[PDB]
Coordinates of N, CA, C and O and ligand atoms in Angstrom, one line a residue:
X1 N 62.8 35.2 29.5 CA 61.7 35.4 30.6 C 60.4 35.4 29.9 O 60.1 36.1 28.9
X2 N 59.7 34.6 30.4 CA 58.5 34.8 29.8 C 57.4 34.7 31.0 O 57.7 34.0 31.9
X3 N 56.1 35.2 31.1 CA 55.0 35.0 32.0 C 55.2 33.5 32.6 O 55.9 33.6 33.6
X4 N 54.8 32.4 32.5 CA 55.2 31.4 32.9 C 56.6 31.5 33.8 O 56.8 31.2 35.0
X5 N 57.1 31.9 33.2 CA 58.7 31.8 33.9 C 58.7 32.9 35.1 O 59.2 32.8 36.2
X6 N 58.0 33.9 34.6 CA 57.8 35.2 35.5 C 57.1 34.8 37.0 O 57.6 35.0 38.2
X7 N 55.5 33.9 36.3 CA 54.6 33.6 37.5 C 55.5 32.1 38.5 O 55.0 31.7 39.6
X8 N 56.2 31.8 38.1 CA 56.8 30.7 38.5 C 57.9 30.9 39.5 O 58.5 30.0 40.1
X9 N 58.3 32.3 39.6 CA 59.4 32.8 40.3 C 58.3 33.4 41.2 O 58.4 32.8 42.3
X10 N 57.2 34.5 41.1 CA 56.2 34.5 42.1 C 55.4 34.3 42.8 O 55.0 35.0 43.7
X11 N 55.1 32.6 42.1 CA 54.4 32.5 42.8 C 54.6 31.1 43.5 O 53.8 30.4 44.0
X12 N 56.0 30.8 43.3 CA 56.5 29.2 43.9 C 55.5 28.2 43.1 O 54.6 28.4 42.3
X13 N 56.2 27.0 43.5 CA 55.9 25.5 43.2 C 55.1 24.9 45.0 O 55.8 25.3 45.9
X14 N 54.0 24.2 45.3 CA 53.2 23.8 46.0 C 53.3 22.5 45.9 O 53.3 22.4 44.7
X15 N 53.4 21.0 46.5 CA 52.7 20.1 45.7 C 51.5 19.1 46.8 O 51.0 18.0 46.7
X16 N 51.4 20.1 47.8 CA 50.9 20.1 48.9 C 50.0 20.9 49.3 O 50.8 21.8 49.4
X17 N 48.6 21.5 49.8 CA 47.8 22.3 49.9 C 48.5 23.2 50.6 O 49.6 22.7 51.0
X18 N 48.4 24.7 51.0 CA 49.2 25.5 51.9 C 48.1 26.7 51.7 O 47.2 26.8 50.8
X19 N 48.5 27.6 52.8 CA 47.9 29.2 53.1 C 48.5 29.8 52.4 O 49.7 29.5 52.3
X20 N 48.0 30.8 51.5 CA 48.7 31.9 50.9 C 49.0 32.6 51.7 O 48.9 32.2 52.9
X21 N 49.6 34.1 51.4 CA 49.8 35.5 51.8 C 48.3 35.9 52.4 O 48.4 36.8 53.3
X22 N 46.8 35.5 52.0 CA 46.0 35.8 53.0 C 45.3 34.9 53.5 O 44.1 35.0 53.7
X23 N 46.1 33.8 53.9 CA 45.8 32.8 54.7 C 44.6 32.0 53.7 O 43.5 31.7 54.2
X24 N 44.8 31.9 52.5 CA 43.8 30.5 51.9 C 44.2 29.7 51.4 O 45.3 29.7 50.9
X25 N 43.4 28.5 51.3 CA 44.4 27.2 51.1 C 44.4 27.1 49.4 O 43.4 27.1 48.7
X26 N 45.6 27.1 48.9 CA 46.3 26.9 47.5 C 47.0 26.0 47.5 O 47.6 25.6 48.5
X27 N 47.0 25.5 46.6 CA 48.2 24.3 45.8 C 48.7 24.9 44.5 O 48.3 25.8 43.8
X28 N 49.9 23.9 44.5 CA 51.1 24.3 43.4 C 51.2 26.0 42.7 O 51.3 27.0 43.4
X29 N 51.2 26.1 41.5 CA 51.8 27.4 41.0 C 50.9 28.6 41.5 O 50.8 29.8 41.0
X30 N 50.5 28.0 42.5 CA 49.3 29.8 43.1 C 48.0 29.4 42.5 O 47.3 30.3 41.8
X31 N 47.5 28.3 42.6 CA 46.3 27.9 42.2 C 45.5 28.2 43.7 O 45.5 27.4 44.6
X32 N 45.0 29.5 43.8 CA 43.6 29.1 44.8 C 42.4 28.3 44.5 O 41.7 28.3 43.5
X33 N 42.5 27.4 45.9 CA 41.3 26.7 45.8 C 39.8 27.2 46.9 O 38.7 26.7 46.6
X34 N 39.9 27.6 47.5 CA 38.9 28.5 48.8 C 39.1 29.2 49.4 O 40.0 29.1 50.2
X35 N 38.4 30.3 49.4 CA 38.8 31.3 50.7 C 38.2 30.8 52.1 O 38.6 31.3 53.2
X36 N 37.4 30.1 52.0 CA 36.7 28.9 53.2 C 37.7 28.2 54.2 O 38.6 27.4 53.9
X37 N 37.6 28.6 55.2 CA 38.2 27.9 56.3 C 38.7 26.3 56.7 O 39.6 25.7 57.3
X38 N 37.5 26.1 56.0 CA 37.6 24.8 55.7 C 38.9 23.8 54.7 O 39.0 23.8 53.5
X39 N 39.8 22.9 55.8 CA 40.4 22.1 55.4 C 39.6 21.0 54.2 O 40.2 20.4 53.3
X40 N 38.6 21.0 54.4 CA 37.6 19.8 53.3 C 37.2 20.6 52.7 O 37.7 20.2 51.6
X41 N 36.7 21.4 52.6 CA 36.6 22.2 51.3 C 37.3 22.3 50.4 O 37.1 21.9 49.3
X42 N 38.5 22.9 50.7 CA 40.0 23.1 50.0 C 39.9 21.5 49.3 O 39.8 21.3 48.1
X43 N 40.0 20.4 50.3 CA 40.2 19.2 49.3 C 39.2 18.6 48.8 O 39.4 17.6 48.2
X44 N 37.9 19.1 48.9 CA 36.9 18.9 47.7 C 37.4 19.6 46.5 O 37.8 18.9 45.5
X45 N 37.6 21.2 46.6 CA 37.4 21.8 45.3 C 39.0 21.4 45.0 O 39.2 21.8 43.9
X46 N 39.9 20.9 45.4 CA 41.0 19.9 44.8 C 40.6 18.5 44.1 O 40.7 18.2 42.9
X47 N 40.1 17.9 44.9 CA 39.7 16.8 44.4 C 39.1 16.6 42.9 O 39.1 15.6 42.2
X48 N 38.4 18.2 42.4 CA 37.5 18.0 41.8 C 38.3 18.7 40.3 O 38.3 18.3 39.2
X49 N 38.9 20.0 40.9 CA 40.1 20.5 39.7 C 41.0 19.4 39.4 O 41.5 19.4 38.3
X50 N 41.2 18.5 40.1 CA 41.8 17.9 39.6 C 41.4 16.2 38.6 O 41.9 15.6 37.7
X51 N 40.4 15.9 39.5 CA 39.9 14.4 38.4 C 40.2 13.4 39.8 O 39.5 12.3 39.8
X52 N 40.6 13.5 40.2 CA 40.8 12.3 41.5 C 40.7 12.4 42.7 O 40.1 13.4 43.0
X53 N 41.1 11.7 43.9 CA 40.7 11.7 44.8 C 42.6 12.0 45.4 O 43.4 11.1 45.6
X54 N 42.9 13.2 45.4 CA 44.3 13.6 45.5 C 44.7 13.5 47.0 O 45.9 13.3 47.4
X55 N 43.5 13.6 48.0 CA 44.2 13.7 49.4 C 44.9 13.9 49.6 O 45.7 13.4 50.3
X56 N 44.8 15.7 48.8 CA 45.6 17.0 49.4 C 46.8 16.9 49.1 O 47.6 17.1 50.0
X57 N 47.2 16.5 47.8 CA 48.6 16.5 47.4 C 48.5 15.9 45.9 O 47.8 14.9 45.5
X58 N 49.3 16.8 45.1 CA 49.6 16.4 43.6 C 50.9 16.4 43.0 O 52.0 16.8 43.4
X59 N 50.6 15.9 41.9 CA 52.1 16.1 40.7 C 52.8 16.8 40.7 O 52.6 17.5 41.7
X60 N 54.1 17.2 40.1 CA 54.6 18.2 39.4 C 53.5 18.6 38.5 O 52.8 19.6 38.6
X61 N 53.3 17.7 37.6 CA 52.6 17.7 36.3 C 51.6 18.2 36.4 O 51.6 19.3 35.9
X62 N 49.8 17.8 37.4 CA 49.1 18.3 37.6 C 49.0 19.5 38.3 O 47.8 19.9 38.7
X63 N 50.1 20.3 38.7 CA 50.1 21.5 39.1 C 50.4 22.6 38.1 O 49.9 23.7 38.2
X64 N 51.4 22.1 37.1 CA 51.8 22.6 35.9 C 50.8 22.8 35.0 O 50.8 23.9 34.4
X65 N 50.1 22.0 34.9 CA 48.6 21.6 33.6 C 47.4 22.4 34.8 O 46.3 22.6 34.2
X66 N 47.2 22.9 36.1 CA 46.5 23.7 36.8 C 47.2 25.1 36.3 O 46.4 26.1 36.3
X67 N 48.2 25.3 36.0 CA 49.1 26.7 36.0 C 49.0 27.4 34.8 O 49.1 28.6 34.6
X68 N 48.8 26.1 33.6 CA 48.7 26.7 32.3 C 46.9 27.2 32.5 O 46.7 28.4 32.4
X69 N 45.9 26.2 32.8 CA 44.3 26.7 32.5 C 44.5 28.1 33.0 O 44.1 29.0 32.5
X70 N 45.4 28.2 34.5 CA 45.3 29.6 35.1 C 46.0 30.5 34.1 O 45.1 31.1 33.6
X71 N 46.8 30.6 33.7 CA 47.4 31.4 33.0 C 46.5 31.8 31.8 O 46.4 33.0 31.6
X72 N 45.8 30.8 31.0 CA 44.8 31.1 30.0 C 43.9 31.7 30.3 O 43.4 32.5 29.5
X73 N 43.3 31.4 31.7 CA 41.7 32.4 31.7 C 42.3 33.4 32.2 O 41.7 34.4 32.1
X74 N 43.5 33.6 33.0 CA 44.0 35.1 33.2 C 43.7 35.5 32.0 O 42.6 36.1 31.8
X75 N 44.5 35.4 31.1 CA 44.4 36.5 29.2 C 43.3 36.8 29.1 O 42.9 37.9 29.3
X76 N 42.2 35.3 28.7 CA 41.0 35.4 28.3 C 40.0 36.5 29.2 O 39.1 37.3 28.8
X77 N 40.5 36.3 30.5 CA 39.7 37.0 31.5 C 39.8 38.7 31.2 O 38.8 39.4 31.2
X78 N 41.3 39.2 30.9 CA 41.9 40.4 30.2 C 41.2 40.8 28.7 O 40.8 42.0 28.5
X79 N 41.1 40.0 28.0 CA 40.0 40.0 26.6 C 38.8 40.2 26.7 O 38.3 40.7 25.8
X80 N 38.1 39.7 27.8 CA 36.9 39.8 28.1 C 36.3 40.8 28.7 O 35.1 41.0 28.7
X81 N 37.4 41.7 29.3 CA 37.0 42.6 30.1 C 37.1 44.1 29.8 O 38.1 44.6 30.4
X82 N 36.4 44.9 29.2 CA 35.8 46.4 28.5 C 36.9 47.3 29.5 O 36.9 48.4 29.0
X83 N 37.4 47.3 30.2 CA 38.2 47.9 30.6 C 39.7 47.9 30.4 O 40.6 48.6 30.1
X84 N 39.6 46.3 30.8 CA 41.5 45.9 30.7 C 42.0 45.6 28.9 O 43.2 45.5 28.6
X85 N 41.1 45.4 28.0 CA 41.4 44.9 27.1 C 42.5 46.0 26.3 O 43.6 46.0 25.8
X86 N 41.3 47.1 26.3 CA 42.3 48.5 25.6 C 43.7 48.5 26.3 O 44.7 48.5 25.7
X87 N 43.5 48.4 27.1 CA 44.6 48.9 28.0 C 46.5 47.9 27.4 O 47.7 48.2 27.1
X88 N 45.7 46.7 27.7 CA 46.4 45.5 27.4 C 47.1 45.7 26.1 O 48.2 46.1 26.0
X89 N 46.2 45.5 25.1 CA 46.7 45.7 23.5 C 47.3 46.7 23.4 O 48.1 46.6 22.5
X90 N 47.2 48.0 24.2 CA 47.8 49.1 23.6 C 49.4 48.9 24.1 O 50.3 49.6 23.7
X91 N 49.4 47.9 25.0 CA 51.2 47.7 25.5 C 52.0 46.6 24.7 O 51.3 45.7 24.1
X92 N 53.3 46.5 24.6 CA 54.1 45.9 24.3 C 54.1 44.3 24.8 O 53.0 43.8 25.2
X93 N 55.2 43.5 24.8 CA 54.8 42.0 25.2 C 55.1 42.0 26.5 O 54.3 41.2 27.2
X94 N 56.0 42.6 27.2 CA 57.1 42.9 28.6 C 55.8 43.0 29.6 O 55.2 42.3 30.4
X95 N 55.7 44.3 29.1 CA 54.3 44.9 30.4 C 53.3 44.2 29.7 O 52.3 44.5 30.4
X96 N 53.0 43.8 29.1 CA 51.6 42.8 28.8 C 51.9 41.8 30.1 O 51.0 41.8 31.0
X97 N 52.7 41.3 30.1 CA 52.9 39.9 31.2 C 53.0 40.5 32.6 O 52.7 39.9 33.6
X98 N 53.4 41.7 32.5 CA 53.2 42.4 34.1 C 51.4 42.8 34.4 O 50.9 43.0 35.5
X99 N 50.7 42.8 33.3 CA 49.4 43.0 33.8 C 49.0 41.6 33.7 O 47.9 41.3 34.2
X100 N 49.7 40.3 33.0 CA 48.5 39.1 33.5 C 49.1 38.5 34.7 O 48.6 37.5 35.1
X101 N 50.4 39.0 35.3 CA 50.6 39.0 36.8 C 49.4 39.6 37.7 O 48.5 38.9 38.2
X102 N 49.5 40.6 37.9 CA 48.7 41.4 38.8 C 47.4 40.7 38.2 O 46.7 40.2 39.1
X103 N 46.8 40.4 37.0 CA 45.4 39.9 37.2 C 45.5 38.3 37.7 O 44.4 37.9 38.1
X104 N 46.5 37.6 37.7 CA 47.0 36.0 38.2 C 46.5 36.0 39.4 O 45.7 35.3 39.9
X105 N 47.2 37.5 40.0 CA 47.1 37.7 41.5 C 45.7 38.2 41.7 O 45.1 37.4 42.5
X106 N 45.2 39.2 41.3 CA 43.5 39.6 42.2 C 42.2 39.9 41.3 O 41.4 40.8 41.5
X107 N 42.3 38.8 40.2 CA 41.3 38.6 39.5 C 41.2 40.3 39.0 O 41.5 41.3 39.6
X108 N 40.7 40.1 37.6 CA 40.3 41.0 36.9 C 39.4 42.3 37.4 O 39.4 43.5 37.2
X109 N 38.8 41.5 38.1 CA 38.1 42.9 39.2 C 38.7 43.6 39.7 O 38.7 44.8 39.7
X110 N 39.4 42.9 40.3 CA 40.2 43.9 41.3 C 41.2 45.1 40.3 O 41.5 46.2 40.5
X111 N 41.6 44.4 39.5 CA 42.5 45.3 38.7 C 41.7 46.3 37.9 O 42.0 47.5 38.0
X112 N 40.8 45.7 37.3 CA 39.8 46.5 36.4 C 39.8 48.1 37.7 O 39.9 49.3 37.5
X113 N 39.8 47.7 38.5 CA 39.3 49.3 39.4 C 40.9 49.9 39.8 O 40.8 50.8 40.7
X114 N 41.6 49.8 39.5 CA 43.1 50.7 39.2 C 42.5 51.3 38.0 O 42.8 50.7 36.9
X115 N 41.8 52.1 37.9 CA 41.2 53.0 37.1 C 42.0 54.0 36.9 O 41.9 54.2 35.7
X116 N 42.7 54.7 37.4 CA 43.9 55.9 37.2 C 45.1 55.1 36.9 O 45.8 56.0 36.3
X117 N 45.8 53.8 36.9 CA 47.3 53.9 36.4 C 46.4 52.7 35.3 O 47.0 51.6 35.5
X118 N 45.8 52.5 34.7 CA 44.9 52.2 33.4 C 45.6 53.6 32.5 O 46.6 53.7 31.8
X119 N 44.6 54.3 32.9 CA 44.7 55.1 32.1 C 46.3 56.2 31.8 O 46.3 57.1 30.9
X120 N 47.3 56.0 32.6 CA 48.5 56.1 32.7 C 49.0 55.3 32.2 O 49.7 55.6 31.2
X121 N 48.9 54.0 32.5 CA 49.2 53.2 31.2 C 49.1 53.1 29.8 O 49.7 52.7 28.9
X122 N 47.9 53.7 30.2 CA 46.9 53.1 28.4 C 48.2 54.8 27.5 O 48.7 54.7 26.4
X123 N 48.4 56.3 28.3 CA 49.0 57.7 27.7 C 50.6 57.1 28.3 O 51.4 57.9 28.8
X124 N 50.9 55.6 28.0 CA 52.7 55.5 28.5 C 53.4 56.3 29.0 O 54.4 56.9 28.7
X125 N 52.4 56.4 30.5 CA 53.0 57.5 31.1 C 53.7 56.7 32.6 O 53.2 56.7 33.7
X126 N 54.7 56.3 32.3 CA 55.3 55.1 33.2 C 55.3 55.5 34.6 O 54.7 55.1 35.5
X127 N 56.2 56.4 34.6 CA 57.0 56.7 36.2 C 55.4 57.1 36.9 O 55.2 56.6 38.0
X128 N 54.3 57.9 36.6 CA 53.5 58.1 36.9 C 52.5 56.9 37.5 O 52.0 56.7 38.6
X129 N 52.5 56.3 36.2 CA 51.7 54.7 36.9 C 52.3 54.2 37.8 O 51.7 53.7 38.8
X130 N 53.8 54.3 37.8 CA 54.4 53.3 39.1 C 54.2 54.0 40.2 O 54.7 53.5 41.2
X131 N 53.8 55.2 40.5 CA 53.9 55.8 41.7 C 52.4 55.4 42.2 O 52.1 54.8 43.3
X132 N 51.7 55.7 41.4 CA 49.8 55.1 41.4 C 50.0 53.8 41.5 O 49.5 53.7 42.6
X133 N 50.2 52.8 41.3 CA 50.5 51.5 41.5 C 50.9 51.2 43.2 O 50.3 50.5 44.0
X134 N 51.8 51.7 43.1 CA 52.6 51.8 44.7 C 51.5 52.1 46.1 O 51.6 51.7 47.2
X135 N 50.3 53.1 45.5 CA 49.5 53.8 46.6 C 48.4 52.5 46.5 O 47.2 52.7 46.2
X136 N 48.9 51.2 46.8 CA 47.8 49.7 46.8 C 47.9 49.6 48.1 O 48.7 50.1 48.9
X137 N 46.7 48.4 48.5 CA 47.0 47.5 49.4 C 47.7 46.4 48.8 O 48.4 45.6 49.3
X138 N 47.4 46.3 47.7 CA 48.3 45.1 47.2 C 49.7 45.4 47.2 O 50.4 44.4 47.2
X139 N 50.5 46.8 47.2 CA 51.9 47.1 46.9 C 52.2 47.1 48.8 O 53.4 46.8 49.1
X140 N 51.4 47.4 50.0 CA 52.0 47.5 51.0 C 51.9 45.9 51.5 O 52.8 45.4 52.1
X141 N 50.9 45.2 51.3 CA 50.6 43.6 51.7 C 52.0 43.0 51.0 O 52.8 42.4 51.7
X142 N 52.3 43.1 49.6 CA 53.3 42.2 49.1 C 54.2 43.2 48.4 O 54.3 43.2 47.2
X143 N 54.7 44.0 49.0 CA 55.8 44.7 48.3 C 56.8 44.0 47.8 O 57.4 45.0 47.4
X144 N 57.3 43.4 47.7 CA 58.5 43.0 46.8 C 57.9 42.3 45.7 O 58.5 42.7 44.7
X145 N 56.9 41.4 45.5 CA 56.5 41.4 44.4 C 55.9 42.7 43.5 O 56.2 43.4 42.5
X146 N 55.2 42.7 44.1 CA 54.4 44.3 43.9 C 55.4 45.3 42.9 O 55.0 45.5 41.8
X147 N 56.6 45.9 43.3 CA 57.7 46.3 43.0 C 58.1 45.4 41.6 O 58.1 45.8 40.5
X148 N 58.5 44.1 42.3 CA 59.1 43.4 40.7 C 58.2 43.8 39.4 O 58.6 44.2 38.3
X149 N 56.8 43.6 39.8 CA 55.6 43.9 39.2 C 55.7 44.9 38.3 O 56.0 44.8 37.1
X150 N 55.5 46.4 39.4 CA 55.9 47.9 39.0 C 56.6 48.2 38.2 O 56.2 48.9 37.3
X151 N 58.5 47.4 38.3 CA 59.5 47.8 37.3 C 59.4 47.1 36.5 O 60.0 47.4 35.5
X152 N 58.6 45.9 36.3 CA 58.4 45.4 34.7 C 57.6 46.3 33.9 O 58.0 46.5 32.8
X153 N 56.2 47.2 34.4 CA 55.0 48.1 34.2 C 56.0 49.0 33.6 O 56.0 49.2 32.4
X154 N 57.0 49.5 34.7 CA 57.2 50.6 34.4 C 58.5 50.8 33.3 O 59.0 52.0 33.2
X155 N 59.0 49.7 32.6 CA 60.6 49.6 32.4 C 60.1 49.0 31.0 O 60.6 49.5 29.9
X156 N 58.9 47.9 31.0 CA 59.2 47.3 30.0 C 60.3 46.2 29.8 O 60.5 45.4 28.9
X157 N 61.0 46.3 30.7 CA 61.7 45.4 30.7 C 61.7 44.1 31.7 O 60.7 44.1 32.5
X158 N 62.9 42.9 31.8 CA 62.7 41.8 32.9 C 63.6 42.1 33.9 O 63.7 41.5 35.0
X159 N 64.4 43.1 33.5 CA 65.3 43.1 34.8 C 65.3 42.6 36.1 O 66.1 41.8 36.6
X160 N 64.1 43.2 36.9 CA 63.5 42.7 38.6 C 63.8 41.4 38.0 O 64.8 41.0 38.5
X161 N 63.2 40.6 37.2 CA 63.1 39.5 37.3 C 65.0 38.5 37.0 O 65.2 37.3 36.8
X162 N 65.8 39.4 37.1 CA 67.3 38.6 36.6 C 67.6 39.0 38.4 O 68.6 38.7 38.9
Ligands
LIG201 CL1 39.8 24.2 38.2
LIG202 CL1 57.1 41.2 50.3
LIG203 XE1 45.7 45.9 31.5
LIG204 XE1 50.5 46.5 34.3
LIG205 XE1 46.7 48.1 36.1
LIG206 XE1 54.1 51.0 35.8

């Protein structure tokens, strides 16, 4: 199991524009492209991640090669960030890839402000963070991910994910 393999069970294969979980239009591995209502928007800012004139449909490949850049500025975004970095380094490889899930999913901001299971994290203090974890809108909106999420945080291990 590895992050790729992780986010790929999470976050499905697309190869067609679609609504997420909060109604925005995404393509393939959980690439958002707009929170804009707009059907043309969505296939401009497609059009343009991608190099061509795709009309709202792509690759395997070009969804895969969208999945890796995402996956990269997730980390980079985690490195960059005076809050999540300590936090990150101070974990193992397991739960490392459980925090570049949750940042895949709501951008580094949003995470950066889980300010209390940070720092439960950062004193490996597990069962505690997963209970602080759980008190989200993100754990009542997508609970079952959320959860797979949690017992990787909180286990260190891939289990959820077998
Ligand atoms: Cl892009
Ligand atoms: Cl769910
Ligand atoms: Xe983190
Ligand atoms: Xe995490
Ligand atoms: Xe977190
Ligand atoms: Xe956790």
């Amino acid at each position: 199991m590895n992050i790729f393999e992780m986010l790929r069970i999470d976050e499905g294969l697309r190869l067609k524009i679609y609504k997420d979980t909060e109604g925005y239009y995404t393509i393939g591995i959980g690439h958002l492209l707009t929170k804009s209502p707009s059907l043309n928007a969505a296939k401009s800012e497609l059009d343009k991640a991608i190099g061509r004139n795709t009309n709202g449909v792509i690759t395997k490949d070009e969804a895969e090669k969208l999945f890796n850049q995402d996956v990269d500025a997730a980390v980079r975004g985690i490195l960059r960030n005076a809050k999540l970095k300590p936090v990150y380094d101070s974990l193992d490889a397991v739960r490392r890839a459980a925090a570049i899930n949750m940042v895949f999913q709501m951008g580094e901001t949003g995470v950066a402000g889980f300010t209390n299971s940070l720092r439960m994290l950062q004193q490996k203090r597990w069962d505690e963070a997963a209970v602080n974890l759980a008190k989200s809108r993100w754990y009542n909106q997508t609970p079952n991910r959320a959860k797979r999420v949690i017992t990787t945080a909180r286990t260190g291990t891939w289990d959820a994910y077998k």
